[PDB]
Write a protein that binds this ligand. Structure first.
Ligand SMILES: [Ca+2]
Ligand SMILES: [Ca+2]
Ligand SMILES: [Ca+2]
Ligand SMILES: [Ca+2]
Ligand SMILES: [Ca+2]
Ligand SMILES: [Ca+2]
Length: 241
């Protein structure tokens, strides 16, 4: 029913702890949100269950940084911890490898292997259960957060070159480390046994996440943000040199 079309790529499976890395070139225009996040599906339901989510969100008005967040508490009463981190070159101008490391003890955010944030204890202790890995591209109705939405900048595209997912195996990883690679995806194709395409929306989101805006071209998974009725991708995928 909404007038804009966004997209979401999500793992069908959820995991308890792990290390997640994605090689991406984000999308950005005033009013947009381009993300990588861990999400306990169902957190949005206000039936008393806990909210469990860890985010990496590039806010459209500020492509030179991304906002990190941990959402706990419960629907209607979220507990948050927004912080901002510089990305250079800008997130929408080059590929970067974004990483999330989630253990019982801490959550670490990395960009090209460098730590930009590590939260220990506190909210992390409430990230119980499982979370799936997701990526989406949409626009928020909160102008103070993402900027007034500039429709003239559409269409926008977020490119994912590859993903790595590691199992949390404390003390049992390569050389006595804490993680063991589980699977990787180079996105030469859309693997439907591993991923799903989002078809939903939520209050505060001006767009409908639709499977129409997920494309697979030349080694990459593309998420698109377009006006409704103009869902398409015909250009070239950027190079990751
Ligand atoms: Ca409508
Ligand atoms: Ca607790
Ligand atoms: Ca506008
Ligand atoms: Ca495996
Ligand atoms: Ca779907
Ligand atoms: Ca690729």
């Amino acid at each position: 029913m909404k007038d804009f079309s966004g997209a979401e790529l999500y793992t069908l499976e959820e995991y308890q702890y792990g290390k997640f890395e994605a090689r991406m070139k984000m999308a950005a225009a005033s009013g947009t949100v381009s993300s990588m996040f861990l999400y306990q599906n169902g957190s949005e339901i206000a039936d008393g269950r806990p909210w469990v989510e860890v985010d990496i969100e590039v806010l459209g008005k500020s492509p030179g940084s991304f906002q990190s967040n941990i959402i706990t508490g419960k629907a209607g009463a979220q507990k948050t911890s927004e912080k901002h981190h510089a990305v250079s070159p800008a997130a929408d101008q080059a590929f970067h490898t974004y990483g999330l490391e989630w253990t019982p003890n801490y959550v670490r955010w990395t960009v090209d292997g460098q730590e930009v944030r590590k939260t220990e204890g506190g909210q992390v202790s409430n990230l119980t259960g499982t979370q799936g890995l997701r990526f989406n591209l949409w626009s928020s109705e909160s102008a103070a957060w993402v900027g007034q939405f500039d429709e003239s900048k559409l269409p926008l595209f977020q490119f994912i070159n590859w993903v790595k997912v590691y199992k949390y195996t404390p003390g049992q990883g390569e050389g006595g480390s804490d993680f063991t690679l589980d699977w990787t995806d180079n996105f030469d194709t859309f693997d439907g046994s591993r991923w799903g395409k989002g078809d939903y929306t939520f209050d505060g989101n001006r767009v409908d996440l639709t499977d129409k805006n997920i494309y697979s071209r030349d080694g990459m998974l593309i998420l698109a943000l377009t006006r409704k009725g103009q869902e398409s991708f015909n250009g070239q995928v950027p190079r990751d040199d």
